[PDB]
Amino acid sequence: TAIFSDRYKGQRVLGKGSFGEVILCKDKITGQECAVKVISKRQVKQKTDKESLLREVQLLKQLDHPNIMKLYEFFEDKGYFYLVGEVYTGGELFDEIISRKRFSEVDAARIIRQVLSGITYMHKNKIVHRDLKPENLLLESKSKDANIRIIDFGLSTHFEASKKMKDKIGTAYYIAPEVLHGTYDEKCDVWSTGVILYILLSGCPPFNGANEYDILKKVEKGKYTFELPQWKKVSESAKDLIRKMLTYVPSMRISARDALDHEWIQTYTKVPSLDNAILNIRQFQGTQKLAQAALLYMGSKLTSQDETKELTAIFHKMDKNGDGQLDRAELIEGYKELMRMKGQDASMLDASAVEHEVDQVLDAVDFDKNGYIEYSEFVTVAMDRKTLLSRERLERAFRMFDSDNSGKISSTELATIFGVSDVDSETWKSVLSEVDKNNDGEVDFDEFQQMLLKLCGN
């Protein structure tokens, strides 16, 4: 019967993970910083019963390995689960790798040794990941010597994954064929690691396609090749390990522990730079992140349409006198009422968070916080703070993808982006034709924003 907000306060948002938002939190007594993953019961269903979840959490809190995220505490209330663990500040592995001048098999081997080391340890404890992918590999700190920390190990056994595409970007490339068909075991993690290793050394997914289902069809057939030009740079032993890890029948697939003893791991963690692989990983990364940002922008526009009208109706009802005037305490009460009905905002953990947010909106609008305020003006501002925020995230991702600083995305590139985003081919072309009436075969940022608004009913 211990409450999460009695102990921890939210400092800021760390980002979106599988199953929920991750908030940087701080212990109110000790000052300890923690990364808290907040899982919404309404958004995410459980796969196991109460007893199985508690026992797994209890085990996970005791486990310790340098390549595995450390879990500290678990909480639960009427609407949420709170997974409290150690903060890591190095960011995603692949974002660090694209910022390097050089990258060799020695670097790749040291990365994969770390991932294999962590996996081996968790397998010894009968914990399977299943959803292992580059976004679940965080560097512990910004130091060039930083260890990789694998996150979300063991979670997918207890929670059902989202079917929504905004939560599924990247996932199809890395999933083992046996997970698609239902009978899987710890060997599925060695497959996913094999896919990651294939991409580290070549910069392209082994199983690819024009959309999610085309990727899944390729994974399911299990056929891949080492026939690209950049594979001629690579040692035969690297390709031998990859073959063992991407073996189709799991009983015949190499174990994590035996992969650590493989000739390639032994030789290269004891050579030329892969310039072409770095080039492809940077493009891969930019493409994946812009599709994510596009889907998140479309989502936040829909969330805004929903919340704006809801908040107006909450205040209209609150305004018993009917003159449009409410005070700060009434605005706070109504904003808290919005959080009860929705439960979308992870950063509004308690009453004290919403009070700060109300004050931030009031200080922006230039209205006095100790008198009565026009609520319609408050609603417009409060929602634009989420609307403009998501608008800037999209733009940054547009600039990053546009590595030539051309200012434009070509029609070929839009097909790639919307393929990863799983927006129907005929559907976006229609939206493009509606906005691109000069047959340029390309769009600038504003035109791209306009397409996305049209692809979420606006």
Ligand X SMILES: Nc1ncnc2c1cnn2CC1CCNCC1
Residue 193 vs 202, nearer CB to ligand X: 193
Question: What backbone phi and psi angles, to 5 degrees, belong to 456?
Answer: -130, 40
Cα Rg of the chain (Å, integer): 24
**CA–CA separation, 365 and 384 (whole Å):** 11
- Using CA atoms, how far residue 193 sits from 55, 279, 289, 325, 369, in Å, is 27, 21, 21, 59, 54
Residue whose CB is less far from ligand X, 13 or 210 = 13
φ, ψ dihedrals at 170, nearest 5°? 95, -30
* Alpha-carbon span 452 to 440, nearest angstrom: 18
Judged by beta carbon, residue 161 or residue 318, the one nearer ligand X is 161
Q: How many CB atoms lie within 10 A of CB 458?
A: 11
Indicate the residue whose CB is closest to ligand X: 15
Write out the H or E segment, with its range, that includes residue 14: strand 8-17
Minimum distance from CB of 120 to ligand X (Å)?
21
294: enclosing H helix or E strand? helix 275-318
Where is 213: in which H helix or E strand? helix 212-221
* Closest to ligand X by CB, 335 or 401: 401
Give the span between the Cα atoms of 289 and 282, in whole angstroms: 11
- Min separation Cβ 199 and ligand X, Å: 17
CB of 136 to ligand X, least distance (A): 8
Pick the catalytic residue from 107, 131, 152, 189: 131
Q: Please give the annotated binding residues for ATP, written as ranges.
A: 37
Spatial distance between the Cα atoms of 229 and 219, rounded to a whole number of angstroms: 22
Active site residue 131: yes
Q: Which residues share a beta bridge with 137?
A: 150
Q: Quickly tell me which residue has 């056929």 as its tokens.
A: 223
Measured from the CB atom, the residue of 82 and 428 that comes closer to ligand X is: 82
Q: Which residues are annotated as a binding site?
A: 37, 319, 321, 323, 325, 330, 366, 368, 370, 372, 374, 377, 402, 404, 406, 408, 413, 436, 438, 440, 442, 447
Stretch (H or E) spanning 316: helix 275-318
Q: Which string of DSSP letters, residue by residue, matches 113-178?
A: HHHHHHHHHHHHTT---S---GGGEEESSSSTTPPEEE-STTTTTTBPPP-SGGGTTTHHHH--HH
Close Cβ partners of 167 (under 8 Å, ≥ 6 residues apart): 18, 161
Contact positions toward ligand X, by CB under 6 A?
A: 14-15, 17, 22, 35, 69, 85, 87-88, 92, 135, 138, 151
- For β-strands 8-17 and 91-92, DSSP reports them as unpaired
CB of 37 to ligand X, least distance (A): 6
Q: Provide, rounded to whole angstroms, the least separation between the CB of residue 134 and ligand X.
A: 9
Q: Which CB, 165 or 379, lies closer to ligand X?
A: 165
Query: Do 82 and 75 meet the contact criterion of CB atoms below 8 Å apart?
Result: yes
Q: φ, ψ for residue 308 (rounded to 5)?
A: -60, -50
- Closer residue to ligand X, CB minimum distance, 14 or 246: 14
Residue placing its CB nearer to ligand X in the complex, 147 or 230 = 147
Q: How many residues does the chain have?
A: 458
Rounded to a whole number of angstroms, the minimum distance from the CB of residue 265 to ligand X is 26
The encoded tokens of residue 48 equal 């196991």
C-alpha 28/C-alpha 343 separation (Å) is: 24
Closest CB 89 distance from ligand X, rounded Å: 7
Annotated binding-site residues for Ca(2+) read 319, 321, 323, 325, 330, 366, 368, 370, 372, 374, 377, 402, 404, 406, 408, 413, 436, 438, 440, 442, 447
Least distance to ligand X, CB of residue 450, Å:
28
Q: Alpha-carbon torsion 419, 421, 425, 429, what sign?
A: negative
Catalytic residues: 131
